[PDB]
Design a protein around this ligand. Structure first.
Ligand code: WAY
Ligand code: CA
Ligand code: ZN
Ligand code: ZN
Length: 158
């Protein structure tokens, strides 16, 4: 029922994290778009400047929300439904430990999950699906959306 009115989308990174170098964070998001763009005709373009539909940034406990973060563990990130404005945004916890290795919460795992919500997908009951409510580490060497997620995204965007 909920979906973007166009396959063209843009995004902008407000800032990186001192936890890892900027290059490590940049390739992390690029891999996320590739995995989702592999089974979707969506086009993602990075904007050097200006406001983008999906802006990614790292926040801290209190930052202007009715229910901010609960500390290190808990909300690893959050986003609002899609919309021609603030919606479609995505915030990450800066108080947590972001690493590209298998430690704490992998940035790629949370990143792929928030995009799923922006695509109009709801939490799935499959533990192998990225939309699973519980955080789980997976081998990004060749991970691909399972049949459950592929059937759902295809049914929405076709
Ligand atoms: C692999 O991707 C993700 C993305 C978000 C989260 S999460 O902690 O924000 N998370 C799910 C959750 C986690 C562990 C125990 N209970 C619930 C949530 C929590 C804690 C509170 C409210 C919403 C979510 C949510 O689903 N956001 O997408 C966990 C894993
Ligand atoms: Ca948290
Ligand atoms: Zn926030
Ligand atoms: Zn979720």
């Amino acid at each position: 029922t909920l979906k973007w009115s166009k396959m063209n989308l843009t995004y902008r990174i407000v800032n990186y994290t001192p936890d890892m170098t900027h290059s490590e964070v940049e390739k992390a998001f690029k891999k996320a778009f590739k995995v989702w763009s592999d089974v979707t005709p969506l086009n993602f373009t990075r904007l050097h400047d200006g406001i983008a539909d999906i802006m990614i940034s790292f926040g801290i406990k209190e930052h202007g929300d009715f229910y901010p973060f609960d500390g290190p563990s808990g909300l690893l990130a959050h986003a609002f439904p899609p919309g021609p404005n603030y919606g479609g945004d995505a915030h990450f916890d800066d108080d947590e430990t972001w690493t590209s290795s298998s430690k704490g919460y992998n940035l790629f795992l949370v990143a792929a999950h928030e995009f799923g919500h922006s695509l109009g997908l709801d939490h799935s009951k499959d533990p192998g699906a990225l939309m699973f409510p519980i955080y789980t580490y997976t081998g990004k060497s060749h991970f691909m959306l399972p049949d459950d997620d592929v059937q759902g995204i295809q049914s929405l965007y076709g």
